[PDB]
Amino acid sequence: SGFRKMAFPSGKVEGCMVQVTCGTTTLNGLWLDDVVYCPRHVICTSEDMLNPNYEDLLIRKSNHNFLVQAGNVQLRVIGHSMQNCVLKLKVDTANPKTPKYKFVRIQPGQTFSVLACYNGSPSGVYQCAMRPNFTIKGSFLNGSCGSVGFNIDYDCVSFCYMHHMELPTGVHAGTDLEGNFYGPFVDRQTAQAAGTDTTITVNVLAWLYAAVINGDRWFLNRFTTTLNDFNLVAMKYNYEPLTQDHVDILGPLSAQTGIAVLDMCASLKELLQNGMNGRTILGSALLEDEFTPFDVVRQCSG
Amino acid sequence: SGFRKMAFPSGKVEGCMVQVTCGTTTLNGLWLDDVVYCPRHVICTSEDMLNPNYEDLLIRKSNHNFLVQAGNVQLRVIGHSMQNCVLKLKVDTANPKTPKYKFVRIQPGQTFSVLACYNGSPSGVYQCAMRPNFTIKGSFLNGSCGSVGFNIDYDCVSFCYMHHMELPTGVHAGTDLEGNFYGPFVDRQTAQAAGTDTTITVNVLAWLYAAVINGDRWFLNRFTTTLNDFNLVAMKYNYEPLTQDHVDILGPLSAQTGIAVLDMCASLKELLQNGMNGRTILGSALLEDEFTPFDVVRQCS
Numbered sequence: 118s119g120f121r122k123m124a125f126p127s128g129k130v131e132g133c134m135v136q137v138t139c140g141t142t143t144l145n146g147l148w149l150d151d152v153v154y155c156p157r158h159v160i161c162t163s164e165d166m167l168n169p170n171y172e173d174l175l176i177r178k179s180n181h182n183f184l185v186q187a188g189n190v191q192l193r194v195i196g197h198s199m200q201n202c203v204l205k206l207k208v209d210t211a212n213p214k215t216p217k218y219k220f221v222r223i224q225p226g227q228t229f230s231v232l233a234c235y236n237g238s239p240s241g242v243y244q245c246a247m248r249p250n251f252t253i254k255g256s257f258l259n260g261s262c263g264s265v266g267f268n269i270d271y272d273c274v275s276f277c278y279m280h281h282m283e284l285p286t287g288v289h290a291g292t293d294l295e296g297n298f299y300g301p302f303v304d305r306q307t308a309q310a311a312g313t314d315t316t317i318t319v320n321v322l323a324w325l326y327a328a329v330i331n332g333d334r335w336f337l338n339r340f341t342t343t344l345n346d347f348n349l350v351a352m353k354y355n356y357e358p359l360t361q362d363h364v365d366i367l368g369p370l371s372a373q374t375g376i377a378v379l380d381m382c383a384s385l386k387e388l389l390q391n392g393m394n395g396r397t398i399l400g401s402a403l404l405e406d407e408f409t410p411f412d413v414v415r416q417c418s419g
Numbered sequence: 420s421g422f423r424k425m426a427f428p429s430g431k432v433e434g435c436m437v438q439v440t441c442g443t444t445t446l447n448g449l450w451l452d453d454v455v456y457c458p459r460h461v462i463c464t465s466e467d468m469l470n471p472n473y474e475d476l477l478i479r480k481s482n483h484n485f486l487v488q489a490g491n492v493q494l495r496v497i498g499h500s501m502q503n504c505v506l507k508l509k510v511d512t513a514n515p516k517t518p519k520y521k522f523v524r525i526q527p528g529q530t531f532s533v534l535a536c537y538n539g540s541p542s543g544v545y546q547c548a549m550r551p552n553f554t555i556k557g558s559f560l561n562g563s564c565g566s567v568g569f570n571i572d573y574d575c576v577s578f579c580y581m582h583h584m585e586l587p588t589g590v591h592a593g594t595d596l597e598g599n600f601y602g603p604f605v606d607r608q609t610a611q612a613a614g615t616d617t618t619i620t621v622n623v624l625a626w627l628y629a630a631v632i633n634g635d636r637w638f639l640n641r642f643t644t645t646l647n648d649f650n651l652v653a654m655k656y657n658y659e660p661l662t663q664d665h666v667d668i669l670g671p672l673s674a675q676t677g678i679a680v681l682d683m684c685a686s687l688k689e690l691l692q693n694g695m696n697g698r699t700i701l702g703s704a705l706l707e708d709e710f711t712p713f714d715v716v717r718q719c720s
């Protein structure tokens with residue numbers, strides 16, 4: 118028992134982190150087989166970052182302009198290419214610690230673990246949910262670019278995120294491992310705003326089931342609701358509509374607690390309308406939407 | 420650059436996790452050099468755990484009764500001994516992945532990362548603070564015993580916790596790596612209660628310093644207090660008294676903000692006596708007590 122925000126063990130990803138330097142710009146890279154993946158803005162100087170013409174900047178670079186360090190061992194760059202916002206550096210040595218891996222693009226509302234790194238050295242690990250507005254609420258400082266997000270399923274690491282930016286609001290933005298940004302962001306030194314965020318409803322419901330499984334029941338009620346009537350109220354409060362697929366995904370948690378999905382919806386409707394009146398759920402004063410049904414099932418099953 | 424609960428990268432500890440089995444009883448162990456450390460209750464059947472006499476149960480065991488596996492690979496046991504609530508099994512192979520390490524006994528309020536393991540396979544990593552009542556608010560299921568808690572300073576892993584128990588209230592209890600329980604708990608299949616918990620004052624102060632560093636400082640008042648007067652007031656609000664070590668570990672945050680420790684204590688005292696009055700600190704209506712002064716430095720710098 119107990120319920121805590123938990124990240125995947127980071128060992129398999131730590132063995133892939135390297136430092137990439139070009140001129141006076143330094144960030145992290147991901148070394149898989151004989152290729153190092155990193156944010157392309159490493160080729161920029163402080164003047165270039167304002168309005169970078171990346172294809173022009175890249176053609177002017179040679180392999181010797183890239184310094185790649187794996188611990189206290191320099192890797193020789195023997196080739197380079199660009200795929201959207203990601204730079205790929207071919208090195209003359211293969212990473213013996215390369216795990217089994219895939220590159221995937223995660224969907225909004227899903228979670229992943231972030232291994233925050235500085236100068237190619239792993240610093241910390243935490244969970245993030247990809248918000249509906251395609252930002253993440255992380256903790257990244259200067260030098261964190263190139264840090265990656267991932268999920269692990271049976272010894273296979275699925276990489277889904279590479280860090281590139283911190284918006285003026287304090288949230289973060291990045292790309293998948295094909296170099297495509299999540300959201301309407303661009304890799305230039307400009308203040309960028311995200312679209313209006315919304316709350317991940319299916320995750321709030323999963324978290325309320327985790328609370329019941331762990332002993333918090335004060336918010337339950339004898340009311341019930343239809344799916345549409347719940348969705349009308351959820352949209353009024355800027356929550357995403359709950360689909361029948363989301364209802365089905367909550368099935369195991371409903372079976373475990375004996376609380377029908379629509380009865381938990383009735384509870385959530387009452388919490389949105391009346392507030393929490395100074396009370397807490399799982400020690401939080403706010404409704405939490407960063408746990409998926411899978412994240413809850415992983416800690417509550419049995 | 421926001422504030423998140425962050426675990427240490429777990430790789431150095433993942434390379435030390437093994438499974439230990441006696442009969443049909445299985446749990447996790449920690450393999451460092453040629454020794455594996457694990458909870459001594461691995462020598463019990465389910466019925467033996469109700470009322471165990473560990474010394475009598477162990478005299479009946481030989482090295483050949485212990486199965487230690489790193490995945491499916493067996494590590495032959497060549498010596499065994501019990502130290503408090505831990506069993507130490509000497510194995511015939513030195514772990515090539517052994518990091519630089521130390522065994523430490525932490526204080527209440529100190530935080531650490533837990534690598535939750537099942538069958539010797541790491542499944543998740545999360546941060547825990549040792550509560551003043553010597554429990555942790557972890558997430559542990561059947562098979563988690565022997566999972567460890569640690570801190571990482573530079574490249575040295577300081578192991579501080581080994582998991583053994585889940586209390587009726589859902590919180591967790593365990594030992595240090597020398598097998599001494601934190602708190603009054605014993606390793607037997609019995610319902611045990613922890614003492615009344617208190618709020619970790621030094622950590623609340625660290626979180627107020629973190630708010631100030633981020634420009635959130637509405638709560639700073641123009642008063643000061645003595646340490647003794649503050650401790651007496653804090654205890655009326657179920658807050659832990661500060662020690663000289665707590666004042667010293669707040670030193671760097673006090674120097675960074677220019678707010679003396681006792682002036683921050685006077686500000687916290689007013690928050691306790693008057694409340695938050697609908698206001699938030701770092702986007703929270705509650706005072707947070709699970710970030711240490713090092714956790715604040717670690718994330719801000």
Ligand SMILES: *[C@@](O)(CO)[C@H](C[C@@H]1CCNC1=O)NC(=O)[C@H](CC(C)C)NC(=O)c1cc2c(OC)cccc2[nH]1
Nearest residue numbers: 257258259260261262281282283285304305306307308
């Ligand atoms: C990388 O480490 C750079 O290599 C860095 C990560 C952030 C630094 C602080 N916390 C972080 O997450 N990213 C950047 O510095 C990027 C670089 C771009 C993609 C070329 N820039 C920003 O994140 C950035 C620029 C501006 C800005 O300008 C003007 C105005 C407001 C916000 C802002 N963020």
Ligand SMILES: *[C@@](O)(CO)[C@H](C[C@@H]1CCNC1=O)NC(=O)[C@H](CC(C)C)NC(=O)c1cc2c(OC)cccc2[nH]1
Nearest residue numbers: 468559560561562563564583584585606607608609610
């Ligand atoms: C270990 O994995 C056992 O090897 C296990 C970890 C807990 C199981 C569920 N989550 C956990 O954290 N620990 C136990 O099962 C221990 C065994 C002791 C050390 C011999 N027992 C308990 O945690 C325990 C027993 C009882 C109890 O009895 C009767 C009544 C109430 C609570 C309770 N906890």
